[PDB]
A paper describes a structure:
In this context, Trametes multicolor [name] (TmP2O; EC 1.1.3.10; for a review, see) is of interest since it can oxidize both β-D-Glc and β-D-Gal to the corresponding 2-keto sugars, which are intermediates for production of D-fructose and D-tagatose. TmP2O is a homotetrameric enzyme produced by lignocellulolytic fungi and has been assigned a role in lignin degradation. Therefore, to evaluate and compare the productive and competing sugar-binding modes for oxidation of Glc and Gal, we used crystal-structure analysis of 2- and 3-fluorinated Glc and Gal derivatives bound to the TmP2O variants H167A, [name], [name] and [name]/[name].
As for the 3-oxidation binding mode of Glc, the [name] variants stabilize the 3-oxidation binding mode of Gal in the α-anomeric state, suggesting that this binding mode is a relevant alternative binding mode also for Gal. In [name] and [name]/[name], the His450 side chain is absent, and similar steric hindrance does not exist. That [name] and [name]/[name] show identical stabilization of the α-anomeric configuration of 2FGlc and 2FGal (3-oxidation mode of Glc and Gal), while [name] does not, supports that this is a unique property of introducing the His450→Gly replacement, and independent of the mutation at position 546. Like Glc in the competing 3-oxidation binding mode, a similar α-anomeric trap exists in the 3-oxidation mode of Gal, however, compared with Glc, this binding mode seems less well stabilized by TmP2O as judged by the apparent strain of the α-2FGal molecules bound to [name] and [name]/[name]. We therefore do not expect the α-anomer of Gal to significantly influence the rate of establishing the productive 2-oxidation binding mode.
Numbering used by the authors:
A (entry chain A), B (entry chain A): 43 to 618
C (entry chain A): 92 to 181
D (entry chain A): 454 to 543
C-alpha cells in the first residue's frame, strides 16, 4: 500500500469494478478498498453459484445468500416468551438486546434491508437480471431533448450489457421456459409482450451457466501483471473506509481515512479522485460520518447545511411473491403431438409422434426430447425431461402495468422448500413496484449507537407513500394473482404475499442524482459528481432519483460509465 | 497434470492434507484431486469462519454450513398436499421425485447424513473440537500390550494436535465460560471432570479466533514454489475420481480413473501409491465402483468375495441437543462481590467492589470487567460484558458416562434462531453417544440409481442397535437434562431432543480397521493398508472400527500419520 | 346463542372443531425419525389411529366431517340460507 | 369458523373474511362407497371416497373463482398474513 494513488475506489462490487475497468484501462494508478474479504475462489469477486456442485444442487444456494445478508436495522424485540423455567433469569423490560437498534421505529422500517461485505459485493450472489429502464422509470441525462437522452442511455446501456455479458438466449431450449412464455404471450396477446429475462450470464453447456459478477466486469487481479504489464491496480481487502476529509470550502476531498481490520492500524490515503461505491446504505454512512448531511435523528429546526438532500427521498420497491404448480392443461399440452397407447410400464405401451406433421403444435426437437423421456422413464408421470432448465420469463414495466416481473425459478427461495411437489411443476412469481421519492422517507445515522464496525448505526424512517405508490402495489399483487393463474394454482406454503420491506434489495435515492442541487433536491449531478466538489464521485443505486420497478444495477452501471467519461476528461493519469 | 506421480491422493479434506503434509514433506511427487472447487479465499482450504465479517456476525454462519451439506440419501416423499387448486397437475402416486433415492427405506435411514464437496472438505466449516479417545473408544494399534498401545497413541495424537494447533486455553478469560464450567465442576465434584473443549484454533485478539482447517495442516499451494523449492505438489480441483483399477490378483492398484468436470475429459493417472481420503461415504462409493465389496442391494446368498466387510458394521452416533437460559442464581453470582446502591440510570447509582477482599468469590480482573460494564451500560440489566466469548465446556467420555459432551455455543444452530432472549444467557448442549458396530448396519450402493455425479447411489440400511447402544442413548438424554438444569432451564424452541440420525456427521466403520481381515471383520490393517493390496491406503473416520462418542477427526488424523510412516518405510520417492 | 359466546365469538371455532369428526382418514405416512433409539417403532406405515386403509389419500375428501348431536350440524352452522337460481337448481 | 391460528396483532375491526364456493359437475366416477371389511366407530361399514374435482369446467371455474376472490378482495384491502389466498381441504 502507498499513501498516494491517482484514483481510490471504496467498494469492490460491480459498480466499483465498473470504475476500475474504465480507469485502470485508461492508465490511472488505482487503489480499491473493500471492508470484506476474498472468499469466491481464485477468480476474485466471482459468482458463488458458478461451482459444479451448486449447479448440481441449486436448492442449497439460498443458504449462501442468507449467509451473507446482514440486516441493516433491527428493532428492539418485544416478543413475550413466558414458558421459561422459573429458575431462568429474565429482565423486567424489553431492553436493547442482540444487536438491535434502539433508534429504529419498528413500524417505519425496512426490515428486510441487508448488506453484503465480501469482495465482489452482492454480485457474488445476485440473480443477474439486467433489464433496461424505459423513460418512465429513468433519470434524465439530457434535459429538453428526449431523443438525445434516449441516444445517450442506449449507448451507455449497450456498453454496460457488454461488460456484464447480458443476453436473452440462454434458456431458449427449455421446455418449461417455453411452456410458460408461450401461454402468457397468448393470453394477453399482444397487449403485453413477454421475453426472456435479460441475464448477465453465458451458458457453457446444457447443465452449466457461468453467471456474471463483479469479476466479469473487472478481474480484480493486482496490476501490473503478465496480461496487463502497463496497468496499475491494487485491491486491499479487509480495509474499512471510515471518512473522506473535506477542505474548508467543501470543494475538494483531501484524503481517505482507512482502518486495516487485520493489523488494526489506521492510515490516511491521498488520491486525485475519490469514488465511493460502498452500496446505497454504506455510501451514505461514510458521507454522514465525514460531515455531509446531518448526524443523528433528523431535526427540521436545524436542517443540514452540506448536501441537505442526502438520505432523504429514499426509495425501495414493494415486492410480491408466490409460487405455482403447473396446470394439467399445460402439462398435457407438452405431449399434445404424441400418440400414446397402452399403460406405462407394460409391454404394449408406446409414445410416438410424426416428425413434420403440420398439425403438430411443437417442432421436432421438442417432441424428440418428450418422446425419449416418456419411453425411457415410464416410472415418471411427467412429460418434462429431468434436466430441463427453469423458465426465465418477464413482461417488462409499462405504463399500463407499472411493475417489473420475473417468472421462473430463483435460487433465493423464501421459506422452507417443500419437497413433496415435483420441482418441474413449480414456477416462481416475483413482481416489483415503483416507489415515489418523498422527502419524509429517510435513511439516517445515529449519533449514539454504532454498528459492528464502529460506524454510526443506520436507521430507516420509511413508509410506502400512501397515494400512487400504495395503489399500484396493491394493483400489482392483483396482477400477479391474475397472471399466475394462467399457468397454474398457488403452491401451498408459497401463497401470494408481500415480502418484508426491503428484502428486494433495490434501495435507491439515498444520494440521488439531478441537474441542480436545490431544484431537483439531489446530491450528485449527471456525471455522478458530488455538488460543489471537484474530485468526489458516488456510484450505485443510491444515485437513482426516480420511481423504478426494474432491477437497478444495469442502470447504476450505466451511470458509472458516464461518470468515468467525466473523470477521463478532467484528470490526467500519473506517469507509469 | 502428468499421467505419473509417486502418490495420488483422492480428497482435500483434513485427512488427505495429513497425507500431503507428511509425504510432500518427505519428498514424494504428489498429486491431489478433489471433486469440489477452491471457494475459501486465497488461503486454499481454510475455515470459512475466519473472516472479520463472520466473527462479527456469527449467527449467520449456520447458513454457510447448511449451504454445503448435501444429503446422502433422501427417501421418496409421501406427504399429502391436498389444498392444490383443482387445475394444478397432480400424479396419482408418490413417484420418485426431486432427487429421492427409491432404494432407501425411510425407516432405516441416516436422514441427516450429508457430504461436502469443496476444497478442504468439511474442515471448511467444522466446529474444530479435537478430543482424544480414551481406551474404551479407541481401536488397538498394538495387541496384548496396553502400555505400548497407549504410548503409540500418545505419540500420534501429540503430532496430530500439533498439526491442527489444538489447545485448551483460547476461552480462559470468558465470564460465561467460567460461569458454566465452575458450576458444573462443583456440582459433580469431582466424580466428573470438566475442562475446555480441546479446539483446533489460535486466538488472534479478544474478538477474533483463527479456526484451524485442512489449510492449517497443509497449505495446498502447488510446489515447487518459493517457500518450498524442492517439494512437488499439485492440487487438481473439480476432478471426480471414479475408479481405482485392480490387477487380476487384487494385489496392486494400477491406475486411477478421473473425470475433469470443467472440460468433461476423462483420464487415467498412474501412481506408486494411491490414498483414498474422500470421506466415509465416498471412499466406500469409489471402492464399490471399483469392484470391491458388492454393488446393489446386499444379498446373503451371494456374499462379496473381495473385502466382504466393506460397508458393513457402520457406526453413527446418537446426538441429543437443547439450549438453556442462564439461571438467576448464576447471573446473580457474576456480581456477587459487588456493592450495588440505588437504581440504574439515576444519580445515586453505584457499583463497587474491593480489590483483594479475601471474601471475594472472583478475582480482580473479573470484577473489573463486571463493574465497568454495569456502570457504563446502566440501560443493560445483565452483568456480563457485551463481547464476552461463549463457553466451550466438556466433560469427556468415561465408563460411568459413556458419551461425549459439548456445552457452549455452536455456530451450527438447529432451527430458527429466536431473537427475544439475550444471547449472553444462552448455552447449547450437545451430547454424542457411542454406537456398537453391527454387521447388519450397512452402507450400500445401487446398481440402478446414480447420484448427481453419475456414481452409484448411496443407500443406508441402519438402525441404532437395540441393546446397549439404545439404552445408553436414552441414558445420555437423561444425563443432558439433569446436567443442563444446573445451569438453567430449557429455551423454548430448543427443548431436549434427538437430532436426525446422522446429522452429527461422525459416521465411521465403513471401511474399518483391524488386525486380521477375517477375524476382526475389517478392510484395512493398522497401517491403513487395504488387505491384500501393496499400494492402496484408506484414510478417514471410515477406518474407525470401535463404538466412539467423541468427535473422530483427530483420531482419523492420527491413524493417517501412522499410515504415512508405513509409506515412508516402503516406497522411495522419485528423483526431483 | 349463549351470552358468553356472543361476548367471546373467537372461541366458537373450538366448539365447531369439537364436533366435526372426519369421515375418511387415510393411512399416515409421515416419517418421524427424531425418536429416541429406545422407543418402539414399526418397520412399516401400518394401519393406525382410526385410519381407513381403503382410502386412496389422493382421491379423498379429507375435510369431510360429520356431526353426531341432537340438531345435527345446525347446532353450529353459519346460518347462510341463499336460494339457488335456475342454473344451480334441480 | 376460523381456519388456522387466530392472530391477535391486527385489530379485528380491520379484518374481513372471504369465502368463495364453486359448483362441481356431477360425474359417475365420483363416489362414496362403504367397505365390506373395515367399520367405523359405530360398527357400520366404513365410508370411503373416490373423488377428484372433474378436470374441465369444474376445475377451470375453481381457478377462475380463486382469481375472482383475489381481484374482489383487493377493493377492500390487502391480504392478512397467515390467511393468504388458498384452497381449503376438499
Ligand atoms: C443479494 C441480492 C442482490 C441482488 C439480487 C439478488 C440477491 C439475493 N439480484 C439482482 C440484483 N440486482 C440486479 O440488478 N439484478 C439482480 O437480478 N441484486 C442487487 C445487486 O447485487 C446490487 O444492486 C449490486 O451488487 C450493487 O452494486 P454496488 O453498488 O457495487 O454495491 P455492493 O453492495 O454490491 O458492493 C459494495 C461493497 O462495498 C463494501 N463496503 C461497504 N462499506 C464499506 C466501507 N465502509 N469500506 C470499504 N468497503 C465497504 C462491501 O463490502 C461491498 O463489497
Ligand atoms: C460439517 C461439520 C463437520 C464437523 C463438525 C461440524 C460440522 C457442521 N464439527 C466437528 C467435526 N469433526 C470433528 O472431529 N470435530 C468437530 O468439531 N466435523 C467433521 C469433520 O469435519 C470431518 O470428520 C472431517 O472433515 C473428515 O475429514 P476427511 O476424511 O478428510 O473428509 P472430508 O469430508 O472433510 O473431505 C473429503 C473430500 O473428498 C472429496 N471427494 C469426495 N468424493 C470425491 C471423489 N469421488 N473424487 C475426488 N474427491 C472427492 C470432497 O469434495 C472433500 O473435499
Ligand atoms: C358444521 C358446518 C355446517 C354448515 C356451515 C357451517 C359449519 C361449520 N354453515 C352453513 C351450512 N349450511 C348452510 O346451508 N348454510 C350455512 O351457513 N352448513 C351445513 C348444514 O349445517 C348442513 O347442510 C345441514 O345441517 C344438513 O342437515 P341434515 O340433512 O338434517 O343433516 P345433519 O348432518 O345436520 O343432521 C343429521 C343427523 O343425523 C344423525 N345420524 C347420523 N347417522 C345416524 C344414524 N345411523 N342413526 C340415527 N341418527 C343418525 C346425526 O347425529 C345428526 O344429528
Ligand atoms: O386454469 C384456469 C385458467 O385457465 C387458462 O387456460 C386461462 F388462460 C386462465 O385465464 C384461467 O381461466
Ligand atoms: O435451579 C435448580 C438447580 O439449582 C442448582 O443450583 C443445582 F445445582 C441443580 O441441581 C438444580 O437444583
Ligand atoms: O388499493 C388498491 C385498490 O384501490 C381501490 O379503491 C380499487 F377499487 C381497487 O380496484 C384497487 O385499485
Ligand atoms: O429476493 C430479492 C431478489 O429477487 C430476485 O432474484 C431479483 F432478481 C433480485 O434483484 C432481488 O430483488
Ligand atoms: O451438528 C453437528 C456438529 O455438532 C458439533 O459442532 C460437533 F462439534 C460436530 O463435530 C458436529 O457433530
Amino acid at each position: 500500500m502507498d499513501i498516494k494513488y491517482d484514483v481510490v475506489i471504496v467498494g469492490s462490487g460491480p459498480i466499483g469494478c465498473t470504475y476500475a475497468r474504465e480507469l485502470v484501462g485508461a492508465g490511472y494508478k488505482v487503489a480499491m478498498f473493500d471492508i470484506g474479504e476474498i472468499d469466491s475462489g481464485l477468480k476474485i469477486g466471482a459468482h458463488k453459484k458458478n461451482t459444479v456442485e451448486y449447479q448440481k444442487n441449486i436448492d442449497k444456494f439460498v443458504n449462501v445468500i442468507q449467509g451473507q445478508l446482514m440486516s441493516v436495522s433491527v428493532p428492539v424485540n418485544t416478543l413475550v416468551v413466558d414458558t421459561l423455567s422459573p429458575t431462568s433469569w429474565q429482565a423486567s423490560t424489553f431492553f436493547v438486546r442482540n444487536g438491535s437498534n434502539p433508534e429504529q421505529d419498528p413500524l417505519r422500517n425496512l426490515s428486510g434491508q441487508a448488506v453484503t461485505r465480501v469482495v465482489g459485493g452482492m454480485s457474488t450472489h445476485w440473480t443477474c437480471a439486467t433489464p433496461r429502464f424505459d423513460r418512465e422509470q429513468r433519470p434524465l441525462l439530457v434535459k429538453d431533448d428526449a431523443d438525445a437522452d434516449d441516444a445517450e442511455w442506449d449507448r451507455l446501456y449497450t456498453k454496460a450489457e457488454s461488460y456484464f455479458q447480458t443476453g436473452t438466449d440462454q434458456f431458449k431450449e427449455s421446455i418449461r421456459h417455453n411452456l410458460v412464455l408461450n401461454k402468457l404471450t397468448e393470453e394477453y396477446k399482444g397487449q403485453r409482450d413477454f421475453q426472456q429475462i435479460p441475464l448477465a450470464a453465458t451458458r457453457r453447456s446444457p447443465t452449466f451457466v457461468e453467471w456474471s459478477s463483479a469479476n466479469t466486469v473487472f478481474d480484480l487481479q493486482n496490476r501490473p501483471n503478465t496480461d496487463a504489464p502497463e496497468e496499475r491496480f491494487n485491491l486491499f481487502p479487509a480495509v474499512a473506509c471510515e471518512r473522506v476529509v473535506r477542505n474548508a470550502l467543501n470543494s475538494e476531498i483531501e484524503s481517505l481515512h482507512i482502518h486495516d481490520l487485520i493489523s488494526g492500524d489506521r492510515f490516511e490515503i491521498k488520491a486525485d479522485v475519490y469514488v465511493l461505491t460502498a452500496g446505497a446504505v454504506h455510501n451514505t454512512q461514510l458521507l454522514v460520518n465525514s460531515g455531509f448531511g446531518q448526524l443523528g435523528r433528523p431535526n427540521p429546526a436545524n436542517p443540514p447545511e452540506l448536501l441537505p438532500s442526502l438520505g432523504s427521498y429514499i426509495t425501495e420497491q414493494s415486492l410480491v411473491f408466490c409460487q405455482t404448480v403447473m396446470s394439467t392443461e399445460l402439462i398435457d399440452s407438452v405431449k399434445s403431438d404424441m400418440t400414446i397407447r397402452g399403460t406405462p410400464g407394460e409391454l404394449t405401451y408406446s409414445v410416438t409422434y410424426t416428425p413434420g406433421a403440420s398439425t403438430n403444435k411443437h417442432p421436432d426437437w421438442w417432441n424428440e426430447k418428450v418422446k425419449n423421456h416418456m419411453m425411457q422413464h415410464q416410472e415418471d408421470p411427467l412429460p418434462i425431461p429431468f434436466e430441463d432448465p427453469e423458465p426465465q420469463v418477464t413482461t417488462l414495466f409499462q405504463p399500463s402495468h407499472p411493475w417489473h416481473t420475473q417468472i421462473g425459478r430463483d435460487a433465493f427461495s423464501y421459506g422452507a422448500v417443500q419437497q413433496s411437489i415435483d420441482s418441474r411443476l413449480i414456477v416462481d412469481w416475483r413482481f416489483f413496484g415503483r416507489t415515489e421519492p418523498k422527502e419524509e422517507n429517510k435513511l439516517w445515522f445515529s449519533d449514539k449507537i454504532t454498528d459492528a464496525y464502529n460506524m454510526p448505526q443506520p436507521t430507516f424512517d420509511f413508509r410506502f407513500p400512501a397515494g400512487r405508490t400504495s395503489k399500484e402495489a396493491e394493483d400489482m399483487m392483483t396482477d400477479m394473482c391474475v397472471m399466475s393463474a394462467k399457468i397454474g394454482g398457488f403452491l401451498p406454503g408459497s401463497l401470494p404475499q408481500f415480502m418484508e420491506p426491503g428484502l428486494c434489495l433495490h434501495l435507491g435515492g439515498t444520494h440521488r442524482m439531478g441537474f441542480d442541487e436545490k431544484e431537483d433536491n439531489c446530491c450528485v449531478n449527471t456525471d455522478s459528481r458530488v455538488f460543489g466538489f471537484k474530485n468526489l464521485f458516488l456510484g450505485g443505486c443510491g444515485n437513482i432519483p426516480t420511481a423504478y420497478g426494474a432491477n437497478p444495477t444495469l442502470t447504476a452501471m450505466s451511470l458509472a460509465i458516464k461518470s468515468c467519461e467525466y473523470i477521463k476528461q478532467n484528470f490526467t493519469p500519473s506517469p507509469f
